[PDB]
Amino acid sequence: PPNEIYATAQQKLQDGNWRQAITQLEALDNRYPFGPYSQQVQLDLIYAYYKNADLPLAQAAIDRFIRLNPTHPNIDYVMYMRGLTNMALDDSALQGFFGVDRSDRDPQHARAAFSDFSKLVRGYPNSQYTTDATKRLVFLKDRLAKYEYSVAEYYTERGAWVAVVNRVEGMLRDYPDTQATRDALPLMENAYRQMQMNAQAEKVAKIIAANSS
Amino acid sequence: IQQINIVGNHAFTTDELISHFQLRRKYQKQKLAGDLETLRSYYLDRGYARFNIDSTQVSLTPDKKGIYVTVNITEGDQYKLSGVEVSGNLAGHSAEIEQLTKIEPGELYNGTKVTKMEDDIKKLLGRYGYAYPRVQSMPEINDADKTVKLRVNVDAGNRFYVRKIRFEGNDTSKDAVLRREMRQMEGAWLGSDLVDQGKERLNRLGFFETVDTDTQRVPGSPDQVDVVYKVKERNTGCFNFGIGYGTESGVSFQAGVQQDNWLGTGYAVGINGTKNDYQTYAELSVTNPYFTVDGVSLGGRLFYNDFQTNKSYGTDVTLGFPINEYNSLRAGLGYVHNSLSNMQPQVAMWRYLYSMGEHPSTSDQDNSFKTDDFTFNYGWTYNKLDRGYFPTDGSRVNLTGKVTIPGSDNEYYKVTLDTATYVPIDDDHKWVVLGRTRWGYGDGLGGKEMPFYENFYAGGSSTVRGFQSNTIGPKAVYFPQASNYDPYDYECATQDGAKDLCKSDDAVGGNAMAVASLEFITPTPFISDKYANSVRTSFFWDMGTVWDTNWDSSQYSGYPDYSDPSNIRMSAGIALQWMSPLGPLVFSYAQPFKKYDGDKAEQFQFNIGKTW
Amino acid sequence: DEAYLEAAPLAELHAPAGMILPVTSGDYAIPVTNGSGAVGKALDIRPP
Amino acid sequence: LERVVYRPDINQGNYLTANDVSKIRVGMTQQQVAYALGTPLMSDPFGTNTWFYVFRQQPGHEGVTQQTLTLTFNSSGVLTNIDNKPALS
Amino acid sequence: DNVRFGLEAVNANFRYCF
Amino acid sequence: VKMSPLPTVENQFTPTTAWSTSVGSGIGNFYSNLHPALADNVVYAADRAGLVKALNADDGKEIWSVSLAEPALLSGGVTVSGGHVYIGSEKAQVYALNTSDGTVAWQTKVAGEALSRPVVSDGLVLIHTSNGQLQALNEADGAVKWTVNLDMPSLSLRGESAPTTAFGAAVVGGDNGRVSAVLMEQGQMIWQQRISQATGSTEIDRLSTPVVVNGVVFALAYNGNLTALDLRSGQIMWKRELGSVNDFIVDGNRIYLVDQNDRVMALTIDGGVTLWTQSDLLHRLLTSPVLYNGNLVVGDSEGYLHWINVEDGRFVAQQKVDSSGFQTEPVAADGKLLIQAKDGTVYSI
């Protein structure tokens, strides 16, 4: 019966081997695809996939769950798990033994995760995960601002002074509240000096001074 | 397919036109459309301005025992081109349009030439920045004189600028790695030739399986484009080590690492070494392909070794930089320690040592010799290959050498040249032909000879396939003082077993070498995609030779003359090169055709590749 | 991991008198949070 | 090294030509100017309603050449001042 | 994942690729 | 897929085999209804490669021959009428030979392969081609008097059945399941009607020969349907859901059919009534039957001839002639039964 398979899966999930838990969940998914716990089993599969870093399966299971029950009373839990799932793809494990700065790696995953957490926070203002999502949103905004910063430095070194001006203006409009913008700001003044555009260089100096400490 | 019948075709016979048909069987699945368009081009490219296919039929035999294919062809006369008039919104480039448009009077009408003209116009405009021109060609057919007049409607549109350049799929490599290979700068006009070079450049590094590009229109403005590159990174480098124990060796181990891309930072590094009861080896190699923004490179290496007899170690640092989009220069300095002991008397070795000023007693192995020399090295390269690991076109040349400087003990020079050329065989690159050659020569200066440990060797998959590694060439001649291995030694070395000077099978290397091969690279349709996509095989003929300069064939009248360069060795066979996910692997089978005494063969060979 | 919790606080910048800053994007906006919810290792992320 | 280190050519900014610069007149609207010249790649984001057109080229081993055009518009989008700096000081 | 190892006189080795 | 049984049959009478002679390479796998013809005690036959011979019908002796293979891909069958011999080709050419001298009198283009048997009407030669265009040529020189154009699906190698005429008009058709009458002087279409329809016709053949019996024209449809039609209208008198497109004969007010699976059936002419069926030759490819000396004669790809009792389907004799097999129909003419093997060997039985 599903009660004993479920109990076994739960015992292994709480404290036990993750392969045994996934085996029991697969047994439930194949043996009782329409039972009273089929959604609890699907949620357990998603959770286990996160635990096991089987990220493509957590994502597929999440999309299937959403299509099957987009109105589930606690679907915001699933969206939260989705947000957790996407952040795990930005930091490679190998990089963790040397202290490699990942700011210069593909930020596309961070943007997707940001979007899902934003949707979670906006749709469920009384969610119990609000502070965690908030801290993550701050982290991700800083991550993207750093990416833009590094691109601006590369072009500054090469001499593509126009690319630098437009890249920094972008940073000024999209991430006005983080450190990367304050650090990039000194780059604008030089860009306006290699090209003889002093009317703006003085304006940059005034902005730098206004927010200096 | 019992037959194909052409009804009413008098200009050409069936075989001439059928030779271009591919559906020559069951379940053709309407592939015939490809053949009909081919037939149209055949006629449309030959001036038959009025050629038209009116109908086709496919008929089945009773019980589906065969298929009958018939085509109804209407033929016209041959037309010649009378001239071309081009008008429209052309951005002043009238001379280039006239130059590409101009045809030779009387030239046979050819629809393909018209299409080619359109493509050249589009490429020209793309070069200037007109990313999306509209060009519409049309014929005017004059039956009165059997000529076709052409008109082309050209619309250059406007100039486009690139707003941003973004990359996707670079999960491991640092973003700076890809921007360095772009020639198109942001905030500048979109010359189309500059983007394609960037696409090609990312395949020159050899860090990616594929490079895709796009030129997407910006939804907020008709004149801006976002250029996006997508890459799929492949495994780059591996780490290995090992150890074991037994009564034949005690304990020994080896380890090392090599990567072409270190943690995604663009540096090329590698470390390896080994230690056992008789030999010590270590190597450190670090290089930075981009020391400076413009691509000045720096690198060097350290090594140490010994053998239980000789000992050596040394260091070198090399600087290099480009001097145009396809050429670069390198130069550097280094130091090598060379200390010998317990040297087995040899004629070549002792002639060298006597020229160096040594005076060992005859057949005395209780000796040593050591020098410490400072040298300078240099080289020149060319590389226009269109691929990283499986080249399909272009060629590569690598000319290098080194010289001694005042203060050294040895005086010598060495020059080597590595070349290869890839030429496609098939229009779709199914078959490829590969040519390969290697040449080298060196000698001493001021009356001295090159140290024997710098000689050239050949054999193994790196030179001439089918022969044992470092076995092609002249063999050692040993002198007949004392040896305690007589009971365990060479017949020509022992003072008791031999009383004269005679030849043995030990190769000593030479002062010049030549290696060449020709390979026909074939597709592997009998291997599924899982494996076939990373492996190629080829049929080949290998030849080469090694010989000794400053060989005193007059004194050694009873032995072969090692100075004769004409004793060319030749072999041929089939090789396989597979870019395994765990590191490319190579092996081959080949048999000799021309051999001399001592030319030990190894018809089947296997080694780890990652070369070329 | 809890490393995400060490991110520095964010704070808006101001313009000097006589100038205006570029108009910001409405994207990546964060609602004001009232402090409800645990963080890091203090959260139970198992299914209900 | 700096004499011989090959530098690929660098382009920056929009493309300007005398044939088009001579076409701009006081009284034209922002749409007419952008149409005649193309969308500018630079502007002053800090309130002032002005556009910049900077034509910059650096051929390798040769030097920097720059044609600078500055267009100042009022609050109604009417061009008020045309600058022209054919060379850097 | 994408590894090879074993134990064999006694001999052992290990390989890891990126 | 299917096994071809060979029933044991006594070779009763040991039917006379007067002679055999080689005429060429034959058909091979280039299937066409390239039957021989006999006229004026002369047997007319040609090799597909373009080799045309005239032979003495008594002993097989060749009396005249011409080779047109400058390969001519001759096809459609040798039609002999009046003073001329008419042979078609897949080159869309028609060659008209004299009967006293087989030198080519003229040839003209017919806009398609002549994959059928030409016939002669009142001074006109009726040619059907693979493109659905039917033409009437002037027998004096091959000039076209009029043309009509029919359409077709891209399905089968079923050449239009040879025209059969009555009342000044020919019954024609093609692989559409359509039967129509065309006026011989002008080419004017009089009426058209379909025999049967099904959605299975996407792959199932519809129509290749019409016969005129007692003022009634009979035709068969491949997709399971036999019909009795009027001569002056597209009027069906009766139909039976049974049919194939092999040539057939009618005599004694009995319909002698060859099915799609080689069943031999004897039917009446006043309705869909079957008198007997012989299943013994099922899945053994047969040629069309003829009636000779009171018995039906068919052959197969094996090389055997079979004599079937016109009364009840009983076999009379079985004798092997040529192991290469038969594809084309036998010819019953001048009181003698001729057959030509798939290979280019002519026999006199």
PDB file of C-alpha atoms in Angstrom, chain A residues 14 40 43-44 47 50 77 80-81 84 87 111 114 118 121-122 127-132 134-139 141-142 144 172-178 181-182 203 206-207 210-211, chain C residues 1-17 19-40 43-48:
ATOM      1  CA  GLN A  14      14.308  12.855   7.078  1.00  0.00           C
ATOM      2  CA  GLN A  40       3.102  15.222  -2.076  1.00  0.00           C
ATOM      3  CA  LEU A  43       6.932  17.769  -4.199  1.00  0.00           C
ATOM      4  CA  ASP A  44       9.187  15.236  -2.498  1.00  0.00           C
ATOM      5  CA  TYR A  47      12.956  18.507  -2.988  1.00  0.00           C
ATOM      6  CA  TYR A  50      17.457  19.828  -5.177  1.00  0.00           C
ATOM      7  CA  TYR A  77       6.222  27.126  -1.947  1.00  0.00           C
ATOM      8  CA  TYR A  80      10.244  29.525  -3.820  1.00  0.00           C
ATOM      9  CA  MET A  81      11.891  26.182  -4.521  1.00  0.00           C
ATOM     10  CA  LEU A  84      16.407  28.284  -4.899  1.00  0.00           C
ATOM     11  CA  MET A  87      20.685  30.136  -7.922  1.00  0.00           C
ATOM     12  CA  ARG A 111      18.552  37.019 -14.201  1.00  0.00           C
ATOM     13  CA  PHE A 114      15.840  37.165  -9.972  1.00  0.00           C
ATOM     14  CA  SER A 118      10.486  38.950  -7.837  1.00  0.00           C
ATOM     15  CA  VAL A 121       7.667  38.452  -3.491  1.00  0.00           C
ATOM     16  CA  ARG A 122       5.117  40.473  -5.467  1.00  0.00           C
ATOM     17  CA  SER A 127       4.827  34.768   2.464  1.00  0.00           C
ATOM     18  CA  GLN A 128       6.950  33.245   5.233  1.00  0.00           C
ATOM     19  CA  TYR A 129       9.972  33.331   2.878  1.00  0.00           C
ATOM     20  CA  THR A 130       9.888  37.108   2.337  1.00  0.00           C
ATOM     21  CA  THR A 131      13.104  37.953   4.200  1.00  0.00           C
ATOM     22  CA  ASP A 132      15.064  35.159   2.530  1.00  0.00           C
ATOM     23  CA  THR A 134      14.722  39.817  -0.025  1.00  0.00           C
ATOM     24  CA  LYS A 135      18.294  38.995   0.960  1.00  0.00           C
ATOM     25  CA  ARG A 136      18.666  36.965  -2.227  1.00  0.00           C
ATOM     26  CA  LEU A 137      17.304  39.822  -4.329  1.00  0.00           C
ATOM     27  CA  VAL A 138      19.897  42.150  -2.846  1.00  0.00           C
ATOM     28  CA  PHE A 139      22.624  39.611  -3.553  1.00  0.00           C
ATOM     29  CA  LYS A 141      21.290  42.821  -7.885  1.00  0.00           C
ATOM     30  CA  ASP A 142      24.847  43.154  -6.649  1.00  0.00           C
ATOM     31  CA  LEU A 144      24.508  41.836 -11.972  1.00  0.00           C
ATOM     32  CA  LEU A 172      23.422  54.157 -13.531  1.00  0.00           C
ATOM     33  CA  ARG A 173      19.846  53.558 -14.643  1.00  0.00           C
ATOM     34  CA  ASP A 174      19.440  49.899 -13.657  1.00  0.00           C
ATOM     35  CA  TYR A 175      21.392  49.507 -10.366  1.00  0.00           C
ATOM     36  CA  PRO A 176      21.590  52.932  -8.687  1.00  0.00           C
ATOM     37  CA  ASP A 177      21.698  51.499  -5.126  1.00  0.00           C
ATOM     38  CA  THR A 178      24.824  49.312  -5.152  1.00  0.00           C
ATOM     39  CA  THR A 181      27.889  51.850  -9.643  1.00  0.00           C
ATOM     40  CA  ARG A 182      29.876  54.037  -7.251  1.00  0.00           C
ATOM     41  CA  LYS A 203      29.119  66.873 -14.002  1.00  0.00           C
ATOM     42  CA  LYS A 206      30.068  66.766  -9.045  1.00  0.00           C
ATOM     43  CA  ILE A 207      28.252  63.444  -8.781  1.00  0.00           C
ATOM     44  CA  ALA A 210      28.115  64.520  -3.788  1.00  0.00           C
ATOM     45  CA  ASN A 211      28.157  60.826  -2.811  1.00  0.00           C
TER      46      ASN A 211
ATOM     47  CA  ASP C   1      25.059  28.070   1.994  1.00  0.00           C
ATOM     48  CA  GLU C   2      24.588  31.293   3.967  1.00  0.00           C
ATOM     49  CA  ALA C   3      27.146  33.425   2.089  1.00  0.00           C
ATOM     50  CA  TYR C   4      24.299  35.341   0.433  1.00  0.00           C
ATOM     51  CA  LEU C   5      23.459  36.811   3.857  1.00  0.00           C
ATOM     52  CA  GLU C   6      26.748  38.759   3.997  1.00  0.00           C
ATOM     53  CA  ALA C   7      25.842  41.081   1.109  1.00  0.00           C
ATOM     54  CA  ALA C   8      26.250  44.741   1.994  1.00  0.00           C
ATOM     55  CA  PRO C   9      23.151  46.884   2.596  1.00  0.00           C
ATOM     56  CA  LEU C  10      21.979  48.938  -0.371  1.00  0.00           C
ATOM     57  CA  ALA C  11      21.443  52.690  -0.268  1.00  0.00           C
ATOM     58  CA  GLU C  12      20.258  55.252  -2.802  1.00  0.00           C
ATOM     59  CA  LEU C  13      22.457  58.087  -4.058  1.00  0.00           C
ATOM     60  CA  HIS C  14      21.519  61.761  -4.290  1.00  0.00           C
ATOM     61  CA  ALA C  15      22.324  64.497  -6.843  1.00  0.00           C
ATOM     62  CA  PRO C  16      24.099  67.776  -6.080  1.00  0.00           C
ATOM     63  CA  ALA C  17      21.978  70.900  -6.207  1.00  0.00           C
ATOM     64  CA  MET C  19      21.334  68.604 -11.357  1.00  0.00           C
ATOM     65  CA  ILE C  20      18.982  65.659 -11.761  1.00  0.00           C
ATOM     66  CA  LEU C  21      19.941  62.000 -11.938  1.00  0.00           C
ATOM     67  CA  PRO C  22      18.899  59.809 -14.869  1.00  0.00           C
ATOM     68  CA  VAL C  23      15.404  58.402 -14.524  1.00  0.00           C
ATOM     69  CA  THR C  24      15.667  54.896 -13.149  1.00  0.00           C
ATOM     70  CA  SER C  25      14.210  51.666 -14.469  1.00  0.00           C
ATOM     71  CA  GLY C  26      11.108  50.250 -12.915  1.00  0.00           C
ATOM     72  CA  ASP C  27      12.691  46.817 -13.225  1.00  0.00           C
ATOM     73  CA  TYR C  28      14.487  45.026 -10.407  1.00  0.00           C
ATOM     74  CA  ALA C  29      12.422  46.937  -7.842  1.00  0.00           C
ATOM     75  CA  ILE C  30      12.231  45.453  -4.349  1.00  0.00           C
ATOM     76  CA  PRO C  31       9.095  45.843  -2.184  1.00  0.00           C
ATOM     77  CA  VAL C  32       9.706  46.962   1.382  1.00  0.00           C
ATOM     78  CA  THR C  33       9.993  43.883   3.614  1.00  0.00           C
ATOM     79  CA  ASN C  34       8.625  43.865   7.175  1.00  0.00           C
ATOM     80  CA  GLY C  35      11.112  41.337   8.617  1.00  0.00           C
ATOM     81  CA  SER C  36       8.838  38.271   8.494  1.00  0.00           C
ATOM     82  CA  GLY C  37      10.703  34.983   8.026  1.00  0.00           C
ATOM     83  CA  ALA C  38      13.861  33.104   9.031  1.00  0.00           C
ATOM     84  CA  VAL C  39      17.035  33.019   6.936  1.00  0.00           C
ATOM     85  CA  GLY C  40      19.776  30.571   6.013  1.00  0.00           C
ATOM     86  CA  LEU C  43      14.601  27.710   7.345  1.00  0.00           C
ATOM     87  CA  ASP C  44      12.826  24.395   6.780  1.00  0.00           C
ATOM     88  CA  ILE C  45      12.776  23.910   3.010  1.00  0.00           C
ATOM     89  CA  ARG C  46      11.137  20.475   3.023  1.00  0.00           C
ATOM     90  CA  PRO C  47       7.678  20.090   1.491  1.00  0.00           C
ATOM     91  CA  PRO C  48       4.771  20.744   3.883  1.00  0.00           C
TER      92      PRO C  48
END
